[PDB]
Tab-separated table of N, CA, C and O in Angstrom:
chain	number	residue	atom	x	y	z
A	1	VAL	N	-2.196	-6.341	-16.027
A	1	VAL	CA	-2.489	-5.089	-15.269
A	1	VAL	C	-1.218	-4.571	-14.597
A	1	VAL	O	-0.280	-5.318	-14.333
A	2	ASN	N	-1.223	-3.262	-14.348
A	2	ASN	CA	-0.162	-2.576	-13.627
A	2	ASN	C	-0.338	-2.813	-12.130
A	2	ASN	O	-1.377	-2.487	-11.581
A	3	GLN	N	0.687	-3.378	-11.479
A	3	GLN	CA	0.571	-3.789	-10.094
A	3	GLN	C	1.231	-2.770	-9.161
A	3	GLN	O	1.127	-2.912	-7.946
A	4	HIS	N	1.826	-1.712	-9.725
A	4	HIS	CA	2.479	-0.697	-8.909
A	4	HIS	C	1.408	0.193	-8.310
A	4	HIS	O	0.343	0.322	-8.901
A	5	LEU	N	1.689	0.708	-7.109
A	5	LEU	CA	0.765	1.529	-6.353
A	5	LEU	C	1.547	2.770	-5.977
A	5	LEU	O	2.390	2.660	-5.106
A	6	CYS	N	1.272	3.894	-6.652
A	6	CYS	CA	1.997	5.141	-6.432
A	6	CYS	C	1.015	6.272	-6.147
A	6	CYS	O	-0.072	6.311	-6.709
A	7	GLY	N	1.435	7.181	-5.271
A	7	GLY	CA	0.693	8.397	-4.960
A	7	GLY	C	-0.741	8.088	-4.579
A	7	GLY	O	-0.975	7.235	-3.722
A	8	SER	N	-1.676	8.781	-5.240
A	8	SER	CA	-3.095	8.675	-4.938
A	8	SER	C	-3.507	7.209	-4.835
A	8	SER	O	-4.248	6.832	-3.938
A	9	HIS	N	-3.019	6.427	-5.801
A	9	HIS	CA	-3.307	5.013	-5.975
A	9	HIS	C	-2.918	4.211	-4.732
A	9	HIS	O	-3.649	3.320	-4.305
A	10	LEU	N	-1.749	4.527	-4.162
A	10	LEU	CA	-1.250	3.856	-2.969
A	10	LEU	C	-2.145	4.170	-1.781
A	10	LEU	O	-2.559	3.286	-1.046
A	11	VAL	N	-2.470	5.451	-1.615
A	11	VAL	CA	-3.348	5.870	-0.527
A	11	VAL	C	-4.667	5.115	-0.619
A	11	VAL	O	-5.077	4.506	0.370
A	12	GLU	N	-5.285	5.137	-1.812
A	12	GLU	CA	-6.549	4.446	-2.081
A	12	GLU	C	-6.430	2.967	-1.705
A	12	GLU	O	-7.294	2.422	-1.032
A	13	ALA	N	-5.390	2.300	-2.209
A	13	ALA	CA	-5.134	0.911	-1.844
A	13	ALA	C	-5.022	0.767	-0.325
A	13	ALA	O	-5.604	-0.148	0.253
A	14	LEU	N	-4.288	1.664	0.350
A	14	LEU	CA	-4.149	1.593	1.799
A	14	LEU	C	-5.489	1.812	2.490
A	14	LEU	O	-5.792	1.104	3.444
A	15	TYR	N	-6.255	2.813	2.050
A	15	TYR	CA	-7.591	3.040	2.583
A	15	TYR	C	-8.422	1.758	2.511
A	15	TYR	O	-9.000	1.353	3.514
A	16	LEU	N	-8.499	1.189	1.296
A	16	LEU	CA	-9.182	-0.070	0.996
A	16	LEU	C	-8.772	-1.144	2.004
A	16	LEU	O	-9.617	-1.655	2.729
A	17	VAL	N	-7.483	-1.512	2.025
A	17	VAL	CA	-7.077	-2.701	2.766
A	17	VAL	C	-7.018	-2.455	4.275
A	17	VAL	O	-7.290	-3.381	5.040
A	18	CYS	N	-6.636	-1.239	4.710
A	18	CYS	CA	-6.448	-0.940	6.123
A	18	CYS	C	-7.744	-0.478	6.789
A	18	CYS	O	-7.824	-0.422	8.012
A	19	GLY	N	-8.740	-0.113	5.988
A	19	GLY	CA	-10.045	0.261	6.503
A	19	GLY	C	-9.996	1.597	7.237
A	19	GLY	O	-8.965	2.272	7.243
A	20	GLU	N	-11.130	1.947	7.851
A	20	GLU	CA	-11.277	3.182	8.607
A	20	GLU	C	-10.409	3.120	9.864
A	20	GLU	O	-10.262	4.128	10.561
A	21	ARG	N	-9.863	1.924	10.152
A	21	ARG	CA	-8.763	1.760	11.094
A	21	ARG	C	-7.615	2.695	10.699
A	21	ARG	O	-6.945	3.248	11.566
A	22	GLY	N	-7.395	2.864	9.386
A	22	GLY	CA	-6.458	3.847	8.867
A	22	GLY	C	-5.074	3.249	8.626
A	22	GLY	O	-4.826	2.092	8.965
A	23	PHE	N	-4.171	4.074	8.075
A	23	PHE	CA	-2.827	3.658	7.711
A	23	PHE	C	-1.797	4.716	8.122
A	23	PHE	O	-2.055	5.917	8.081
A	24	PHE	N	-0.609	4.239	8.502
A	24	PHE	CA	0.509	5.102	8.848
A	24	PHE	C	1.522	4.991	7.716
A	24	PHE	O	1.759	3.900	7.195
A	25	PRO	N	2.151	6.108	7.297
A	25	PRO	CA	3.056	6.090	6.145
A	25	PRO	C	4.270	5.165	6.368
A	25	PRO	O	4.194	4.029	5.929
B	1	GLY	N	11.238	2.025	2.131
B	1	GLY	CA	9.950	2.563	2.615
B	1	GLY	C	8.801	2.177	1.693
B	1	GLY	O	8.985	1.405	0.766
B	2	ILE	N	7.607	2.723	1.925
B	2	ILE	CA	6.448	2.153	1.254
B	2	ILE	C	6.541	2.407	-0.252
B	2	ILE	O	6.251	1.506	-1.035
B	3	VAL	N	7.008	3.580	-0.705
B	3	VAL	CA	6.923	3.846	-2.134
B	3	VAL	C	7.958	2.969	-2.848
B	3	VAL	O	7.687	2.409	-3.888
B	4	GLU	N	9.122	2.755	-2.250
B	4	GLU	CA	10.096	1.850	-2.842
B	4	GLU	C	9.511	0.440	-2.964
B	4	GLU	O	9.693	-0.206	-3.987
B	5	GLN	N	8.819	-0.030	-1.912
B	5	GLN	CA	8.367	-1.416	-1.832
B	5	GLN	C	7.147	-1.639	-2.728
B	5	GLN	O	6.956	-2.737	-3.243
B	6	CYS	N	6.308	-0.605	-2.892
B	6	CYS	CA	4.960	-0.764	-3.427
B	6	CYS	C	4.760	0.024	-4.724
B	6	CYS	O	3.928	-0.334	-5.560
B	7	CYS	N	5.515	1.112	-4.893
B	7	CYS	CA	5.352	1.954	-6.056
B	7	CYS	C	6.408	1.635	-7.116
B	7	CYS	O	6.074	1.398	-8.272
B	8	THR	N	7.683	1.680	-6.721
B	8	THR	CA	8.816	1.357	-7.584
B	8	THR	C	8.804	-0.130	-7.932
B	8	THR	O	8.866	-0.522	-9.102
B	9	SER	N	8.767	-0.952	-6.880
B	9	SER	CA	8.514	-2.373	-7.006
B	9	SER	C	7.035	-2.653	-6.732
B	9	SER	O	6.293	-1.748	-6.389
B	10	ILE	N	6.634	-3.924	-6.842
B	10	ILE	CA	5.276	-4.388	-6.595
B	10	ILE	C	5.215	-5.030	-5.206
B	10	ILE	O	6.006	-5.929	-4.920
B	11	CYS	N	4.236	-4.646	-4.371
B	11	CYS	CA	4.032	-5.335	-3.095
B	11	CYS	C	2.739	-6.154	-3.071
B	11	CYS	O	1.811	-5.895	-3.816
B	12	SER	N	2.701	-7.162	-2.193
B	12	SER	CA	1.533	-8.007	-1.973
B	12	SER	C	0.617	-7.391	-0.934
B	12	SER	O	1.063	-6.572	-0.166
B	13	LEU	N	-0.648	-7.829	-0.885
B	13	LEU	CA	-1.547	-7.471	0.207
B	13	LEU	C	-0.835	-7.504	1.546
B	13	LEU	O	-0.908	-6.515	2.273
B	14	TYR	N	-0.143	-8.617	1.835
B	14	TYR	CA	0.493	-8.808	3.121
B	14	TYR	C	1.425	-7.644	3.408
B	14	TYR	O	1.369	-7.089	4.489
B	15	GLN	N	2.273	-7.289	2.433
B	15	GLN	CA	3.239	-6.232	2.652
B	15	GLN	C	2.507	-4.929	2.861
B	15	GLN	O	2.934	-4.101	3.646
B	16	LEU	N	1.498	-4.677	2.030
B	16	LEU	CA	0.745	-3.449	2.173
B	16	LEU	C	0.192	-3.330	3.591
B	16	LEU	O	0.232	-2.257	4.173
B	17	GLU	N	-0.411	-4.412	4.087
B	17	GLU	CA	-1.106	-4.412	5.368
B	17	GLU	C	-0.146	-4.124	6.527
B	17	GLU	O	-0.592	-3.744	7.600
B	18	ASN	N	1.155	-4.298	6.316
B	18	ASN	CA	2.149	-4.016	7.343
B	18	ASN	C	2.191	-2.523	7.676
B	18	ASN	O	2.939	-2.150	8.564
B	19	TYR	N	1.411	-1.677	6.974
B	19	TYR	CA	1.468	-0.235	7.188
B	19	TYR	C	0.114	0.323	7.616
B	19	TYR	O	-0.046	1.537	7.671
B	20	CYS	N	-0.837	-0.552	7.934
B	20	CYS	CA	-2.108	-0.152	8.505
B	20	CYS	C	-1.971	0.050	10.007
B	20	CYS	O	-1.380	-0.804	10.669
B	21	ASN	N	-2.617	1.109	10.522
B	21	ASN	CA	-2.776	1.328	11.953
B	21	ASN	C	-3.680	0.262	12.592
B	21	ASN	O	-4.423	-0.400	11.834
């Protein structure tokens, strides 16, 4: 599998792992 | 920054989590 997280994919991953707590760039 | 660490290269959960509020 592709393990890189770019653009939309990165945000989604951040949403997932950081939760509704949210993420800072 | 995050895209260099995670997009260009591959990051782990741990590294990713370093950018959660």
